Design an enzyme around this catalytic site. Sequence first.
Site, PDB file in Angstrom:
ATOM      1  N   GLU A  76      -6.968 -33.316  -7.001  1.00  0.00           N
ATOM      2  CA  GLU A  76      -6.442 -32.668  -8.195  1.00  0.00           C
ATOM      3  C   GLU A  76      -4.981 -32.247  -8.084  1.00  0.00           C
ATOM      4  OE1 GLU A  76      -9.079 -30.050 -10.346  1.00  0.00           O
ATOM      5  OE2 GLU A  76     -10.812 -30.859  -9.241  1.00  0.00           O
ATOM      6  N   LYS A 111     -16.096 -15.952  16.136  1.00  0.00           N
ATOM      7  CA  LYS A 111     -15.140 -16.660  15.265  1.00  0.00           C
ATOM      8  C   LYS A 111     -13.913 -15.765  15.009  1.00  0.00           C
ATOM      9  CE  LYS A 111     -18.895 -19.036  12.769  1.00  0.00           C
ATOM     10  NZ  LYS A 111     -19.857 -18.788  11.650  1.00  0.00           N
ATOM     11  N   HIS A 158     -16.078 -22.025   6.911  1.00  0.00           N
ATOM     12  CA  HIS A 158     -16.669 -22.298   8.210  1.00  0.00           C
ATOM     13  C   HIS A 158     -15.884 -23.236   9.118  1.00  0.00           C
ATOM     14  CE1 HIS A 158     -19.394 -23.824  11.254  1.00  0.00           C
ATOM     15  NE2 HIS A 158     -20.105 -22.728  11.085  1.00  0.00           N
TER      16      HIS A 158
END
Lengths: 321, 336, 321, 336
Positions: free
Chosen positions: C95, C287, C246
């Site tokens: 896009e 993380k 993620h």
Amino acid sequence: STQVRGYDFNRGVNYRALLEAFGTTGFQATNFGRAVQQVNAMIEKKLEPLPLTSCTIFLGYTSNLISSGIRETIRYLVQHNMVDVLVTTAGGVEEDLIKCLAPTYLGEFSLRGKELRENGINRIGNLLVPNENYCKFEDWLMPILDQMVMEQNTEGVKWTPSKMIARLGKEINNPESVYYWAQKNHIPVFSPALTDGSLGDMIFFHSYKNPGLVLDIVEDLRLINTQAIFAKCTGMIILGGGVVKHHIANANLMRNGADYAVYINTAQEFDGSDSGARPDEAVSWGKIRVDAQPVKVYADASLVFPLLVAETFAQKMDAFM
Amino acid sequence: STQVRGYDFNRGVNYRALLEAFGTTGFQATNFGRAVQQVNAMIEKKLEPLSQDEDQHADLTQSRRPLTSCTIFLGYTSNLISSGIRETIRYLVQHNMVDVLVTTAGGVEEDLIKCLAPTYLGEFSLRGKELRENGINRIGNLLVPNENYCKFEDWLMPILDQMVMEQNTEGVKWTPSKMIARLGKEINNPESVYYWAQKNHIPVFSPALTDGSLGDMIFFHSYKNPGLVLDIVEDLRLINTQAIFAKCTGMIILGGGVVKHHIANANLMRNGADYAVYINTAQEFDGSDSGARPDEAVSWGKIRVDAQPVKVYADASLVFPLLVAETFAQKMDAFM
Amino acid sequence: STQVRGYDFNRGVNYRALLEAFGTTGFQATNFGRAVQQVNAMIEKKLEPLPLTSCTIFLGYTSNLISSGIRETIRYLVQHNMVDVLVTTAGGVEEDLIKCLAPTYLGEFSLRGKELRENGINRIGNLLVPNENYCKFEDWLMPILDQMVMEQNTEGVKWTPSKMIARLGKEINNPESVYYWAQKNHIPVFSPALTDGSLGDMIFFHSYKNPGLVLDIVEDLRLINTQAIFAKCTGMIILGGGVVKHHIANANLMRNGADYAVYINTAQEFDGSDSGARPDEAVSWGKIRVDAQPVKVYADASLVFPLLVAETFAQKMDAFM
Amino acid sequence: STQVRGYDFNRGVNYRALLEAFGTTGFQATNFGRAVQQVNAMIEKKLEPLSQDEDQHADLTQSRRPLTSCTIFLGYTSNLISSGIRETIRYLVQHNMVDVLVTTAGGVEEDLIKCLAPTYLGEFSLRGKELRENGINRIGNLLVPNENYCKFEDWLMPILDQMVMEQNTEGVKWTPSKMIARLGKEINNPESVYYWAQKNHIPVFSPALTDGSLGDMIFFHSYKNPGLVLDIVEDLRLINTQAIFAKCTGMIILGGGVVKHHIANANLMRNGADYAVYINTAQEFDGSDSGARPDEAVSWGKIRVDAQPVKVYADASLVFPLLVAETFAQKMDAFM
Ligand SMILES: NC(=O)c1ccc[n+]([C@@H]2O[C@H](COP(=O)([O-])OP(=O)(O)OC[C@H]3O[C@@H](n4cnc5c(N)ncnc54)[C@H](O)[C@@H]3O)[C@@H](O)[C@H]2O)c1
Ligand SMILES: NC(=O)c1ccc[n+]([C@@H]2O[C@H](COP(=O)([O-])OP(=O)(O)OC[C@H]3O[C@@H](n4cnc5c(N)ncnc54)[C@H](O)[C@@H]3O)[C@@H](O)[C@H]2O)c1
Ligand SMILES: NC(=O)c1ccc[n+]([C@@H]2O[C@H](COP(=O)([O-])OP(=O)(O)OC[C@H]3O[C@@H](n4cnc5c(N)ncnc54)[C@H](O)[C@@H]3O)[C@@H](O)[C@H]2O)c1
Ligand SMILES: NC(=O)c1ccc[n+]([C@@H]2O[C@H](COP(=O)([O-])OP(=O)(O)OC[C@H]3O[C@@H](n4cnc5c(N)ncnc54)[C@H](O)[C@@H]3O)[C@@H](O)[C@H]2O)c1
């Protein structure tokens, strides 16, 4: 430590077993299993020997749930004296009565308000209520409102939402009505903002034809708070948020917390709302005892409540008779 | 047909242009742009002169508040008063930019208590057991010391003694709105929303005024000094008549629940609001009134069919100050 | 202890002051203030002396944000080398390119799919994209895809999503394109499921006219993971959830956690999703470093991101030149 | 015109009747009732015999899976495999009730790992610092020990050695779907979704297969045994052709993201799915594909205009087992 495991359909379809397996399925299925346990604990406590019982249960629900079929689920619990106090907003009262006069229909969320209005239809989520329902309501209600003003001025009656709700349940005189059963079984119904709905509209119109009706909310606060204060134990079952949730929790704060609490609502906490607050916020306030194990199921109660009732209250039909 | 295009920071940090660019940014940024236009339309209408015929009808209310071409109803949930939006709301009320206020119990009492003691920033994850052990109450990611309610009790009890006295000896008939005007008069502090509301003759409705700390106090107080009656029927007439005799009406609702429906329902009585802007986080899927799109209200006649209502799906703590900055605050002069 | 206080408009309207007051307003306004602080900390670190920098910043965003005007905000950051790695899904790539050929328009969420389809219009939230946009895209893309197959078979090129995205940015050759700037400034773009969109459609159709194109996702995993492993410090700015969230977090887990993390998304945690997981869940995984002070703003990024950029990156335009 | 009416427990706990009554209960209970009807329509169509002409067209795919009158695509997010819905999905796949599976990385690996070590129940509020210090990983209110991934690594590494070997010496061209068939063959355990999927020739697509633990392993492994290539282009052809040569197609999507769009996009290639049921918690206000109503997909041609798609706004951990119980499980016989 419990392992995660869902229902195995190779066993075929046993619904009781399917529901029980939610506890080990995870996410909200597990919270549902916890809710089943907590409500059963409330019931077990209520059935303990010491009309006061060993556990005063407060059932709260938002207006739209009475528009929904959950109206039948709630009527069942009240019909059999399974709960002790009811708390709902204005729509929660009037729509139960109106359903005894005319039905509510299924629709869709996307139906345009312009067209619906041009056709005399009112939308409630994916449900539809014809304007004509409110006209029948008005005809039914006006003569009762006249008796109420009269009893107030000549018989010393000091109306409050709860007293009015008992009177309307008695007047509707229909076994299908939640409030018909509530007053029959002496289960009080609190609704501080009872003027916020169609019953308000009618009280408004009626006041210009027969002025004077007073609805005091102070006496009703005393009544609900004393229900919690003098309770051996209390359990809270709240469907949705808003006034219904906080009014029951605040009443329990007066006894230093509820012993059991199960919430089923779709509100989220991020906006700081009381509706979306986790039960742990209520613990900080003392609305829920610190030793309690409150449970919140994040889900539409139209789906969850019938299942919860099936695995708890409906399983004890015997004791409640 | 407008094209999607976001603000280009290569132009530098031109805040006015940045905010205007929200209209063509998409999703809720675009809804924000629409809310700005709608609230500005409300203001433009309010500043419109009342014609002879209009003035005749609008003056048919007992209220001494000066008639305007657009009666604007401002509603907000309790927690927004605990938040800093309390200053945003006080500003609008202080300068007579809105005409009717509707809020729940916490929304009244917390404004007053903030004049006696502050609210503090916290975190959502703070455990209730520890907070309680430390006499702290949690409201979202905000913190309120138990002590705040003690000060409130000391400030309030004498006022309740007077109110009961006035009720019994002077024949006063209390309702939530009258009590809220009195409390605002009593707090006598320019930082209070309600102080300004009563000063500027802006009525405040709260049908479930007993559902909070003020209810706690009335409850305790009733045992030493019994008899206080708060009628909600008179207050329904009062709020409905405000909508019925309005030339035009605009609704600005932050959050849902009683606050949203009570304002919408008052406007149904005049067959719909002319302008409506909602800023709330509720969703429609659960069939709740809180989560209903404005179009649901159109089916009821709470919003006129020709109106172009707007709902911004967002936390009002982030959106409202920005909205006010692009609308009411830009017309400050006109309101003085 | 900070007291709650909102902006006082009696001071008039100073936008910088209005934004700064969010920190003390409460709820998400406060989280926004915290996000401003964390992003500024990332920038301060990036500007610290030791093209590697003292802080590798990973910017992630879902496809729809590129359909929105946030496309300009992102292009700005990339144009001025303010971030080091980009991660977006397929729509997020195509896009941006298509917007250099034909525009996207504003619409409404309620527009019916039947009518829109009959008119050759595609809906994305309250935005609208004409079928003709994809036709121009196809014409533009086909000859590039031919060169790609040719380079692969005769020049040994082993395509991966990131290499393809660099090539397309270079081909679009338009200063308005995020990817045109990304490849110009050597900012890699990762998109493991790059086939999940219109660019996939085109690769599909094109393969029947010129078979053989291979897009390997294994090499791209090595590339993104090594970006985090060899970083002095890393900051994560993630708009939305899903693969974008993620994939950036997992890359940082490889260095034992990100030093800074700011999330802006509307997902909720109750469904157990990774999208809706609070940053604290990510800390359990490693993380996000345990000592980090991650921030999540629960809001539509179309509203929040431009404001965040205004109070952070745009304030440091100087240093970045 | 159906009237709203909930199940009356005065009839006793008749589960079948209780679940049927959801259709007239309202809000999402009614959407559930609609989902049941739609999935049953999908099944009724699937059991329909293929005519000579239909059979000719449907057989135009290379796949050896037996052609049916309705190709059903089942998609679900990673976390649902960590949840007990993993057993619900395995059941459907074991008995060939669906034809194509689409899931993200976690959705593949967690099924395999569950054959080596279990997942445990926890709480959402468990702090990450303590969990990490204790070698525990949180997934919603579920818990997975670090040890689980060690066992996975030991089980997987030898398989990756073989795959690279096969790629280089036997000329295999790996794609996510081929690797997932191989892993399911290797796990050789009847409790595994993927074991059954490969046994029953049900392809599994996952374009971003590198985004998870399996990606971690491939990454580490690539340093000792370099060269593994996973092409996503071949896999796009494979999933699209499954939709293109279908007599009819049904979509059952749990959750949003890549899983939802990848299935919808494959169906756009045949100009729309004939049946579609979505069960997800996402909302539309943020303009996300995940949160888009089915009607948005209709504008794209992902769902045929004549279809009557349904979306249940709820956690699939609660809804899916109930849906399966009223649809697929009721037709167990037909599938054997
Ligand atoms: N039924 C109506 O729409 C209607 C009709 C007439 C008057 N009213 C009036 O509107 C006012 C505001 O309504 P309210 O406070 O009863 O509730 P509400 O509809 O405003 O809902 C409050 C919150 O409860 C939760 N909730 C609602 N429905 C739920 C569901 N199905 N499952 C789980 N959680 C759910 C949501 O988080 C919601 O934001 C009331 O005071 C009432 O008198 C209601
Ligand atoms: N401040 C408090 O938390 C508190 C304190 C004392 C008493 N109470 C009592 O709690 C009862 C219920 O509270 P309520 O009716 O004021 O509303 P609420 O807190 O229940 O919120 C109602 C709904 O409004 C929306 N909303 C709330 N905060 C929002 C925000 N920041 N941005 C946008 N939308 C938002 C949400 O959809 C929410 O579910 C009241 O009757 C009141 O007396 C409030
Ligand atoms: N733009 C499109 O609708 C579209 C177009 C073509 C292809 N696709 C494909 O669809 C697949 C799934 O899309 P996705 O993973 O990019 O994201 P998504 O649209 O599925 O959104 C994922 C989650 O991110 C959050 N989110 C999204 N928009 C947000 C916003 N404005 N503010 C804050 N949080 C927001 C929400 O919690 C949402 O559920 C992609 O793989 C992509 O290739 C997207
Ligand atoms: N299990 C895990 O949390 C985990 C583990 C390892 C890797 N991952 C990776 O995380 C990435 C993103 O995850 P994802 O795309 O699978 O989805 P996700 O977890 O991001 O969820 C996507 C959306 O689906 C909906 N959803 C999720 N759970 C739902 C539920 N219980 N009921 C109904 N709707 C639900 C929500 O709107 C959510 O925002 C994947 O690419 C995957 O490889 C997942």
